[PDB]
Structure 1
Amino acid sequence: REKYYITTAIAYPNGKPHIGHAYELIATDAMARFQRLNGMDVYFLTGTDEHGIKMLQSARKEGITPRDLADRNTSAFRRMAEVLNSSNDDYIRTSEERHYKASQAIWQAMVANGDIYKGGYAGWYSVRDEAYYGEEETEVRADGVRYGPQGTPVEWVEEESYFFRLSAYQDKLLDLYENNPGFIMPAERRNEIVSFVKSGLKDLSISRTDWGIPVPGDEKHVMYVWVDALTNYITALGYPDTTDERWAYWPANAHIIGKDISRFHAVYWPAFLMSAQLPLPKRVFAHGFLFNIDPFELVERYGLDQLRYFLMREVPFGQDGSYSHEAIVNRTNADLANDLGNLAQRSLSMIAKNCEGKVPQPGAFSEADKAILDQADAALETARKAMDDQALHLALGAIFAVVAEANRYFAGQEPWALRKTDPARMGTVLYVTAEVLRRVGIMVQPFIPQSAEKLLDILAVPADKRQFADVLASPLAGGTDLPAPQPVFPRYV
């Protein structure tokens, strides 16, 4: 069984969880579940990034230690994962001892390759981004203060600092981008990165000089928060122990991240991995941002699956998008409550009332029967091709187009009228509808897991007949008992 490793960015837990974090986790969860159902051996990581100057300063404001703050706020992030029904296999915190040892190992690996030196710089520095900047990347605003590109103040500094020889990787990075056209996506991101690297790379500062991982052999220094943070992805697999059973999951198939942190993952990270003699992830994919506050309240007001569906359907993955009360209510009423849920309820109640709650024996399929059935099978192939490109909206779009067409099929067959005229044919039509519903049910599991389970329970589908392979392999059999149908998607109160 082919191995598939997917990760989310690890959030700074310096406050409460926000919807950005929830969005990223839901989308990564969907992708992970999709691949499980598609027959892969999946490892799915998320976690928290607990070092950094931004954590230090938040700790000071609250008047506690950064470990204290990290420990307190992290519980909320873990609780968010449980509430969003996240299927992650591990949870990483960069305060753990395994990470400390991982980060010091990858560091040593880069030193062994000759890519790390101690040196002197003189330039603008932002304390909060732990990064130097060139005068060109800065501006003096009306308050008379010079700001760097990432929004924060820069001051002039002359210090010794450890450096990574990022200049030695310009050409190897450009080859990576030619040879692997899907390494950093979507396209708008690819071009930012390719252009940034074509225009020249300066060596990168990777230490400062008391909350972080000490640079091995020189404890007066601590590792820049990004070197540390990126290592999370290989820490979770047992690095540096390459005989750990998890290690075969490396290289990651997909790092899901937000667009504001592309450069770290598509430039720094591969450079570091090359240096440490490790293989590179197959893809980094950057989602956009959401605009209107608290994920827990949203789940409470709308339902988890309603929110999951909305976010993954209404925004093209990669692009920025909007959400509002009215949008979520209307789109989830239309697609879930009405289109899918009411097709299930009407059809399954007709089977309950008119066929003794047994799946009816289908006869010859008509042209219209074969068309809707085939459209369902076709949706699986489209969903697969979509998810390979992180196109969650297209995967869901294809599956729900089958739902829309199934309502038209149902209405147009007029099965109530057939009750009197032709009960054999009524049965065939109810069969088809039930069978289309089984195929949809299987396909939507990754996106709306609990609701999908409830819809398949209603269709009496065994627990071991809900893989994507079962869409073609395991059709409903006439005669099977079905429990009394309750609505799966209540209309919004």
Structure 2
Amino acid sequence: VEKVFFVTSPIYYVNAAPHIGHVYSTLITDVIGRYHRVKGERVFALTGTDEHGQKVAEAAKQKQVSPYDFTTAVAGEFKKCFEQMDYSIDYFIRTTNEQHKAVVKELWTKLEQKGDIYLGRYEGWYSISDESFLTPQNITDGVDKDGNPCKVSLESGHVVTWVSEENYMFRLSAFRERLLEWYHANPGCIVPEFRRREVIRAVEKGLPDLSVSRARATLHNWAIPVPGNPDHCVYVWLDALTNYLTGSRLRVDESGKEVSLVDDFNELERFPADVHVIGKDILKFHAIYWPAFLLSAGLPLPKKIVAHGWWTKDRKKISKSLGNVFDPVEKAEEFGYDALKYFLLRESGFSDDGDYSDKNMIARLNGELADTLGNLVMRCTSAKINVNGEWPSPAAYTEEDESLIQLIKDLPGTADHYYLIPDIQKAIIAVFDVLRAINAYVTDMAPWKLVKTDPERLRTVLYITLEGVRVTTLLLSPILPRKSVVIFDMLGVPEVHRKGIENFEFGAVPPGTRLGPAVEGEVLFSKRSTE
């Protein structure tokens, strides 16, 4: 099934400025997209902002501005931040978009015509901050911002309020069996595995019907009207999840501006998502509600949902109100963009809540990027070792030579599998296991002595090293997109050989290829003092 590989991030609430969590989710989306482009596939990578709802409306009122001006301004902050982060995202969607609204109304009407929406009541707890309905088992006692006793979410700790409203209800209870059948038929469809198990357990227990509208006053009229009923607004989450469908149907011009909404998703060959990237906090929406809506509407289901953890800094919660900020742009200016991306993707897996510190950041940058990767690139390109400034023609390979070559040949298949799970941390570790092996081979062969002692042997050692650096760098190119270009330039790898599965093969760059010119004193990753 040849198709556009479709990868998404969440669309973020615009109640406040963008921060590490948004940057991280979008980074993961970006990396997955980049890897599939490197394989020569068609890719559409989507990110954006979730701009309706009571949460956003009350954030605007607290700043005392119009919701239109507020959402526009904060959406602009997200766009600027992502531009600065140097992603390769194909479209940035906003739920205030008029074509998105049309797709939401269309989907609603399909659900209704299917018989899965009825007029009922919700009486229960709601978290405005999570826009989430909660049972009494999912709240506990806590304190409000005036210090008074209130109820709070056990999941998020935000304040909950009791809602009692005549609402349109979606028959979620009727999809239990079909959802379980979907999880069991596709046991890789939620990653990591323990989060898949959580979803299955939750759905096993039973599902209540879900409120998919609210009275218009509650939302301060900042939402999409229910087709045929002006007194109701569409649940912000049904509106929000629909962004994935809208995005799959938007034709986008060179400037990244939407110019047309197509009638049917098949026309652009994107829907359904191959990967939805999300945080663990929004798993039920994506793994339970979304597939149920899609089943009701007769739409195909996503292939994989990958849910990551939440970051801390110096083992404490990241917060402006407390004394612990973590600004990605600032840290990227300090340590480098590719380096910061590397750290975020290497330091933690999707099953973990990662922790940043300047100490650990510096140790990875010095140890892995400078001492392992950078040092190797400089060694095989130096005029002192590579006297002719080119890829030599290798002579006969020893067993030691071949053992390293085997690792280099095996690497693409292994990295590929990890990128597809996806488990980016493991992909990175696999590549760096090969970089460490190449370094120990270089140390063991001492090519600097071979220049005088055995130039023929040096040709072999040097060729293996160059090719190892090239293959590893290609597989890291989604992680270090700017630095990989610098590496390929230093190596003189022609543009055509910088992507495509043909170039996963050992030996793709021929002997006699000239290295790129040298710039005096210009290192790849400069080591930084440990403060």
| TM-score bin (small chain) | over 0.9
Distance 1:218 1:80 in 2: 38
Taking the TM superposition and a 5 Å limit, the aligned residue runs for 1:11-410 are 11-141=12-142, 143-149=148-154, 150-209=156-215, 210-238=221-249, 241-243=262-264, 247-292=268-313, 293-350=326-383, 355-410=387-442
Distance 1:414 1:19 in 2: 43
Q: Give yes or no for contact 1:17–1:295 (8 Å, CA) kept in 2.
A: no
Unaligned runs of at least 5 residues, structure 2? 216-220, 251-260, 314-325
Q: Give yes or no for contact 1:17–1:294 (8 Å, CA) kept in 2.
A: no
Cross-structure match for 1:491:
527
Query: Is the partner of 2:168 in helix, strand or coil?
Result: strand
Cross-structure match for 1:479:
512
The alpha-carbon deviation at position 314 of structure 1 amounts to: 1.5
Distance 1:106 1:479 in 2: 59
Deviates more, 1:32-41 or 1:167-176: 32-41
Q: Give yes or no for contact 2:497–2:508 (8 Å, CA) kept in 1.
A: no
Q: 1:49 to 1:490 in 2, by over 3 A?
A: same
The alpha-carbon deviation at position 232 of structure 1 amounts to: 0.3
Distance 2:125 2:447 in 1: 74
Q: Give yes or no for contact 2:121–2:167 (8 Å, CA) kept in 1.
A: yes
The alpha-carbon deviation at position 245 of structure 1 amounts to: 6.4
Amino acid at match of 1:264: F
Deviates more, 1:120-129 or 1:60-69: 120-129
Distance 2:65 2:369 in 1: 46
Q: Give yes or no for contact 2:393–2:511 (8 Å, CA) kept in 1.
A: yes
Distance 1:243 1:388 in 2: 27
Distance 2:37 2:127 in 1: 43
Identity %: 39
Amino acid at match of 1:234: L
Could you give the per-residue CA deviations for residues 173-221 of structure 1, whole angstroms, max 9, x where no partner exists?
Answer: 1111111112222122112211111111111011112101111111221
Distance 1:307 1:128 in 2: 29
Unaligned runs of at least 5 residues, structure 1? none
Q: Give yes or no for contact 2:121–2:169 (8 Å, CA) kept in 1.
A: no
The alpha-carbon deviation at position 294 of structure 1 amounts to: 1.1
Q: 1:123 to 1:20 in 2, by over 3 A?
A: closer
Q: Give yes or no for contact 1:317–1:390 (8 Å, CA) kept in 2.
A: no
Amino acid at match of 1:489: F
Q: 1:375 to 1:223 in 2, by over 3 A?
A: same
The alpha-carbon deviation at position 478 of structure 1 amounts to: 2.2
Could you give the per-residue CA deviations for residues 9-47 of structure 1, whole angstroms, max 9, x where no partner exists?
Answer: 111122111111111111221111111112321111011
Distance 1:125 1:344 in 2: 55
Amino acid at match of 2:300: P
Distance 1:121 1:479 in 2: 73
The alpha-carbon deviation at position 378 of structure 1 amounts to: 1.0
Amino acid at match of 1:175: E
Distance 2:38 2:70 in 1: 38
Q: Give yes or no for contact 2:190–2:304 (8 Å, CA) kept in 1.
A: yes
Q: 1:21 to 1:157 in 2, by over 3 A?
A: closer
Taking the TM superposition and a 5 Å limit, the aligned residue runs for 1:433-448 are 433-448=465-480
Could you give the per-residue CA deviations for residues 256-290 of structure 1, whole angstroms, max 9, x where no partner exists?
Answer: 10000000000000000011110100111100111
Amino acid at match of 1:227: L
Q: Give yes or no for contact 2:170–2:211 (8 Å, CA) kept in 1.
A: yes
Root-mean-square deviation (CA, aligned residues, Å) is 1.9
Distance 1:241 1:263 in 2: 29
Q: 1:132 to 1:80 in 2, by over 3 A?
A: closer
Amino acid at match of 2:333: E
The partner residue of 2:462 within 421, 424, 430 is: 430
Query: Is the partner of 1:120 in helix, strand or coil?
Result: strand
**Aligned pairs, number:** 492
Q: 1:156 to 1:243 in 2, by over 3 A?
A: closer
The alpha-carbon deviation at position 327 of structure 1 amounts to: 0.1
Amino acid at match of 1:386: Y
Q: 1:270 to 1:381 in 2, by over 3 A?
A: same
Distance 1:134 1:339 in 2: 51
The alpha-carbon deviation at position 491 of structure 1 amounts to: 1.7
Query: Is the partner of 1:32 in helix, strand or coil?
Result: helix
Amino acid at match of 1:266: A
Cross-structure match for 2:257:
none
Q: Give yes or no for contact 1:5–1:42 (8 Å, CA) kept in 2.
A: yes
The alpha-carbon deviation at position 361 of structure 1 amounts to: 2.2
Amino acid at match of 1:159: E
Deviates more, 1:356-365 or 1:371-380: 356-365
Could you give the per-residue CA deviations for residues 372-423 of structure 1, whole angstroms, max 9, x where no partner exists?
Answer: 1221121111101111211111111111111111111111111122122211
Q: Give yes or no for contact 1:305–1:451 (8 Å, CA) kept in 2.
A: yes
Deviates more, 1:24-33 or 1:55-64: 24-33
The partner residue of 1:421 within 433, 445, 453 is: 453
Distance 2:528 2:240 in 1: 41
Q: Give yes or no for contact 1:207–1:221 (8 Å, CA) kept in 2.
A: yes
